Each structure stands twice: as structure tokens, then as C-alpha cells.
């Protein structure tokens, strides 16, 4: 069936859209080639519509059925509970999309009578009615990228499809416990969202070492959300239903599946009918869990079809990496084609065709790769990095323009040991926080799709707990990593190391001069910038820091605030 049908009504914005990085003294000090940085807008929604719209053909075989049976068996070991209206309300981001029924996210969080009553009525309706398609809004996302000259043309806007706030709270009540606990039970060590960046590195390295002649590949599905069929979504529901659930949960899950998850009408911000969806909704609670299960099922079966030897998968939504035993270069290329053919039959055709890789450092998954640097003792150590282009472009935008959610803070947290997060992101943003006297102000950021309020002054202990003390003393980064950063700095027009070091020393001195948590930031985050090093001992606050909850599950598109 067609992933989408369209009426001709436009996908409309509801606020002004800026497409060019503005000229701004603060962002200019970070990167001067502002014309390289753009944001997507509703103007390119038509381009995206064409890309996401196609007929899916799906044929299922014995391998598919076998894997599904195994997954259901694991799912049957899971007991999940309904959330109360209170608990669900508390998971709603403060700035989540308001309801069309006269209340917003703040009212939901405050347990406002108008909010809570409508939620109860939506829930009751889910129980009474298991057929009527539920309305969704479709919007073009405004996301920031750098121009890729070698590729041609800007990325068009991604779309988001989401039901009303009232429905989203009901999804949490029925399914929050399921989507938080089920994936790890079903997929075990293959479930990527259970890992911190360091734990992800550990899993990848150990998996690589477990093979005699390791070979790995990332598999890019062409528009994964759109490839997801009614069958796939019903199969996901059948997996959910294997859980030990309350009767009202079972009914609500069945209802949400029939009325929302399988498909439904698309409405623009002007209230006009834009068309109809028969694929994954990108803005529902089950997007991440559904994609992860479905990607895992199809890939596991395709591994068997391709007769890959000892395939180990790591899955995060639609992001898939496979590590296996090499059968030789020609044999590997042939087996990857068979894998691709199998995935295609399952309705997960390739974007870029998968390529066998024999160096672990060259495998990119979740937009990231393992690399090597040296710790204080000179020992080679593994850590997670990524190309810094998008992080830096977004940092520049977030410098020039105010936004609730700050990718830069998430990037510092997740990539704290990296050359670029330390040299550039920490230096740049602490200089701004110093200038603004806003070090004490908590900021919102995203980790694995969930939103968190984080105090920048807590960064030293957060980094220690997450990455260890070595994050503050890594040096001698790999030539490949240094070269990649070098290319980025040239492309974006970012100042060189000598400039960042100078800026960092000044930032550090000021932080130190202020005492308290500010001084701890100066000492630990910027020790790299000084000749006369300070001794970096374990921070007492880090030992009593429970960073569990951060890496339990993925919630991208799921409207989750922790
Ligand atoms: C990209 C290239 C043209 O320039 C650089 C080369 C190396 C580095 C790393 C410098 C280093 C890090 C420490 C954390 C931030 C800067 C690590 C290192 O090996 C020595 C050092 O003085 O600091 C940055 C650079 F910007």
C-alpha cells in the first residue's frame, strides 16, 4: 500500500521560519562561514513528501516467522503496569504541543481539572471505540545542518506526525512501562539504548574482538518510517500483547494500534486535511520501540537468509550495525547483497548500499564511531566520537538564536572525551555563560530522545560518572580523528587550537576566580589548556550520582520529559 496519500493541502508552519544562520558576533567567533549553515523549513516539505511516499511490497518467510516466535517468547516474560494519570502527566515536557481542547502542557503538568478530565475522556473513548482513526497533525521540522558540497542540494525538512496532547498522555498510561522495559528483554545486548556512550564503545569493541576475522557494516534503510507496513505495526502489537498486562491496558493498546499506530488522517497547522498515513507515525510513544523491534526482527531474519556467520546486531530505532565473521572479501560482498535482498523483501530496502568494513574505527553507527586516544599514563583507550560538523553548526545557531532545547549541552555530555567537545563546545559555551552570568541556570537537552533539565555547573561530576576522570586528561587523538576535525574547521571557518586554548585559559581563570561549582568547572573541564596542570581527583558529588534512567530506553518522537 502507499505509505501516504496527499490531498494537495500544504504542510504549513505556525511560526516564522529562518533558513540562514544570522550574522551575529558571538556565533561568528565560533565559525565565520555562516553561509554554510542552514535550517530546514516548511518550504521544502514537498520534496520530503515525494521522498516518503511509495508503495510497499512485503513478503514474509520462515526466517522471519522463526525470529518473531523467539521474540514473542522473550516478550512473554515481561510484566508491565499501567501508569496513573498523575505519573503520565509528570512525563510531559513543559513546552509540549498544546491540546486543541483548550489546555497546554503546563496545565497537564499542574494536573489542571480541564486537562485531567479530557484525558479521562480520551481514555474512556479508547476503551469504547477501537476503530475510528485518530487525528494527527503533520509539521515540517526546523533542523540545522551544514551544506554538503560533495552531495549537492540541501536536505529537505523532516516531517513529524503526532496526535493531540490528550492522546499522548493516554499513550504513556498504556505503554510507557512497555516501551521502557520490553525492548531490552526481547533484544538483550542488541538493544542499543541501554548503553551510555562508553558502554556502547565497550559492546562494540568486545563484539569486534569476539570474531576471529571481524567484518561489520551499517545498514541504512531508505526512509525507515515509511517502509513500516500495517503488518509490521500489527506484529509489534502482538509482541506488546505477549506481556502480562492489565485488561484496560490490553484494550487501550489494541485501540491505539487500530486507531493511531496503523495509520490515520493528517491535518496541517491550519486545520486542513493534508492526506492519510499507512506507515509509522514519527511522533508517537511507540516510534522508537516499534522501529527498534521491527528493525531487529527484519535484520535478524535477513542474517539467516544471507547465512552470515555469527552475526551480532546493535539496533537503535532504525539505526542498524551488524558485526560478523568474514568469509573473505568477495564472499562478504556477496553475502551483503543477499542480506540487502532479504531486507528489501521484508520492506526495508537500502538507502546507501551496505559496505563491508574491516576496521572498527571506520564503522559509523548512531552517527558515531569508536576511536582511540591516550590517557594520562599514555595508555591507548577507546571512546565514542562523531564528525563535529552538525554539532558545531547547531552550536552556532543556538548561539545566535534563543531556543528551549540546547543540542550543545547534550553534545558536551555525550561527547565529553572528544577533542572537539572539549576544545570548542566547552570553551565557547562557558564563555557565554560567564558573560551572561547564567552558569546557575538549568537548561533543557535531549538524551536518547528524552528531555532533561541539566545544570551546566554539574558537568564535571556528570562527565566523571559517565566517562570517568580520563575524560579530563585524554590527549594524542588519532590521526584520522584529528584530520576529520581539521577538515571541519576549514569548512566551517572555525578558529584553530591556539585560539581555543587562549580562550579556554581565560574562561578557566575566571571560573577559578569565582569559587564554588564554577571553580570546579574551571579546574576539571579546562585542565587541558594549561601547562601547570592541576591534580584531578574524584569529585565527591560524582560518587552519589545516579545516571541510570538516562540509558534505559529510546524515546525519540515520544514526548518524554525526565
Ligand atoms: C585539527 C588540527 C588542525 O588541530 C588540532 C590538533 C590537535 C588537537 C588536540 C589538542 C589537545 C586537546 C585536549 C582536549 C582539547 C584539545 C590534545 C592533545 O594531544 C594536546 C593538547 O594540547 O590538547 C586539536 C586541534 F585543533
Swiss-Prot record:
Cofactors (names): Mg(2+)
Cofactor note: Binds 2 magnesium ion that constitute a dinuclear catalytic metal center.
Record's subcellular location: Host cytoplasm; Host endoplasmic reticulum membrane
Catalyses which reaction(s): RNA(n) + a ribonucleoside 5'-triphosphate = RNA(n+1) + diphosphate
Domain RdRp catalytic: 214-332
Phosphoserine modification, residue list: 29, 42
Modification after translation: The N-terminus is phosphorylated by host PRK2/PKN2.
Activity regulation information from UniProt: Activity is up-regulated by PRK2/PKN2-mediated phosphorylation.
Domain of life, source organism: Viruses
Annotated binding of Mg(2+) 2, by residue: 220, 318-319
Result when mutating residue 220 to C/G/N: Complete loss of RdRp activity
Function noted in UniProt: RNA-dependent RNA polymerase that performs primer-template recognition and RNA synthesis during viral replication. Initiates RNA transcription/replication at a flavin adenine dinucleotide (FAD), resulting in a 5'- FAD cap on viral RNAs. In this way, recognition of viral 5' RNA by host pattern recognition receptors can be bypassed, thereby evading activation of antiviral pathways.
UniProt subunit comment: Homooligomer. Interacts with non-structural protein 5A. Interacts with host VAPB. Interacts with host PRK2/PKN2. Interacts with host HNRNPA1 and SEPT6; these interactions facilitate the viral replication. Part of the replication complex composed of NS2, NS3, NS4A, NS4B, NS5A and the RNA-directed RNA polymerase embedded in an ER-derived membranous web.
Name of this chain's protein: RNA-directed RNA polymerase
Organism expressing this protein natively: Hepatitis C virus genotype 1b (isolate BK) (HCV)
Amino acid at each position: 500500500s502507499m505509505s501516504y496519500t496527499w490531498t494537495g493541502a500544504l504542510i504549513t508552519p505556525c511560526a516564522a521560519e529562518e533558513s540562514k544562520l544570522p550574522i551575529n558576533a558571538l556565533s561568528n567567533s565560533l565559525l565565520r562561514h555562516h553561509n554554510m549553515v542552514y535550517a530546514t523549513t516548511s518550504r521544502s516539505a514537498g520534496q520530503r513528501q515525494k521522498k516518503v511516499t511509495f508503495d510497499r511490497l512485503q513478503v514474509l518467510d520462515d526466517h522471519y516467522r522463526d525470529v518473531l516466535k523467539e521474540m514473542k517468547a522473550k516478550a512473554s516474560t515481561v510484566k508491565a503496569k499501567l501508569l496513573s494519570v498523575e505519573e503520565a502527566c509528570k512525563l510531559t515536557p513543559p513546552h509540549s504541543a498544546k491540546s486543541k481542547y483548550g489546555y497546554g502542557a503546563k496545565d497537564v503538568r499542574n494536573l489542571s481539572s480541564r486537562a485531567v478530565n479530557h484525558i479521562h475522556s480520551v481514555w474512556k473513548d479508547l476503551l469504547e471505540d477501537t476503530v475510528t482513526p485518530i487525528d494527527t497533525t503533520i509539521m515540517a521540522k526546523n533542523e540545522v545542518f551544514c551544506v554538503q558540497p560533495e552531495k549537492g542540494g540541501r536536505k529537505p525538512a523532516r516531517l513529524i506526525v503526532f496526535p493531540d496532547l490528550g492522546v499522548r498522555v493516554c499513550e504513556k498510561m498504556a505503554l510507557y512501562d512497555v516501551v521502557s522495559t520490553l525492548p531490552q528483554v526481547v533484544m538483550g545486548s542488541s538493544y542499543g539504548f541501554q548503553y551510555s556512550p562508553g558502554q556502547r564503545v565497550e559492546f562494540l569493541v568486545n563484539t569486534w574482538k569476539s570474531k576471529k576475522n571481524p567484518m561489520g557494516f551499517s545498514y541504512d534503510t531508505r526512509c525507515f518510517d515509511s517502509t513500516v507496513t500495517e503488518n509490521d505495526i500489527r506484529v509489534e502489537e502482538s509482541i506488546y500483547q505477549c506481556c502480562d498486562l492489565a485488561p484496560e491496558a490490553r484494550q487501550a493498546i489494541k485501540s491505539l494500534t487500530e486507531r493511531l499506530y496503523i495509520g490515520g488522517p493528517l491535518t496541517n497547522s491550519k486545520g486542513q486535511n493534508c492526506g492519510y498515513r499507512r506507515c509509522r507515525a514519527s511522533g508517537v510513544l511507540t516510534t522508537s520501540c516499534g522501529n527498534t523491534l521491527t528493525c531487529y526482527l527484519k535484520a535478524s531474519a535477513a542474517c539467516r537468509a544471507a547465512k552470515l556467520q555469527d552475526c551480532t546486531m546493535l539496533v537503535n530505532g532504525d539505526d542498524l550495525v551488524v558485526i560478523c565473521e568474514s568469509a573473505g572479501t568477495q564472499e562478504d560482498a556477496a553475502s551483503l547483497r543477499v542480506f540487502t535482498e532479504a531486507m528489501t523483501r521484508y520492506s526495508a530496502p537500502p538507502g546507501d548500499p551496505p559496505q563491508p568494513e574491516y576496521d572498527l574505527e571506520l564503522i559509523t553507527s548512531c552517527s558515531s564511531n569508536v576511536s582511540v586516544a591516550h590517557d594520562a599514563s599514555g595508555k591507548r583507550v577507546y571512546y565514542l566520537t562523531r564528525d563535529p560538523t552538525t554539532p558545531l553548526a547547531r552550536a552556532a545557531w543556538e548561539t545566535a538564536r534563543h531556543t528551549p532545547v540546547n543540542s550543545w549541552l547534550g553534545n558536551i555530555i555525550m561527547y565529553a572525551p572528544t577533542l572537539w567537545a572539549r576544545m570548542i563546545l566547552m570553551t565557547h559555551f562557558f564563555s557565554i555563560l560567564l558573560a551572561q552570568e547564567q552558569l546557575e541556570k538549568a537548561l533543557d537537552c535531549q538524551i536518547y530522545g528524552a528531555c532533561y533539565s541539566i545544570e551546566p555547573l554539574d558537568l564535571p561530576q556528570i562527565i566523571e560518572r559517565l566517562h570517568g576522570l580520563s575524560a579530563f586528561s585524554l590527549h594524542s587523538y588519532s590521526p584520522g580523528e584529528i584530520n576529520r576535525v581539521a577538515s571541519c574547521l576549514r569548512k566551517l571557518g572555525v578558529p584553530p587550537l591556539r585560539v581555543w586554548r587562549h580562550r579556554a585559559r581565560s574562561v578557566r581563570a575566571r571560573l577559578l576566580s569565582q569559587g564554588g561549582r564554577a571553580a570546579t568547572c574551571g579546574k576539571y573541564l579546562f585542565n587541558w589548556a594549561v601547562k601547570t596542570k592541576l591534580k584531578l581527583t574524584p569529585i565527591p558529588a560524582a560518587s552519589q550520582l545516579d545516571l541510570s534512567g538516562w540509558f534505559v530506553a529510546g524515546y525519540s518522537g515520544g514526548d518524554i520529559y525526565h
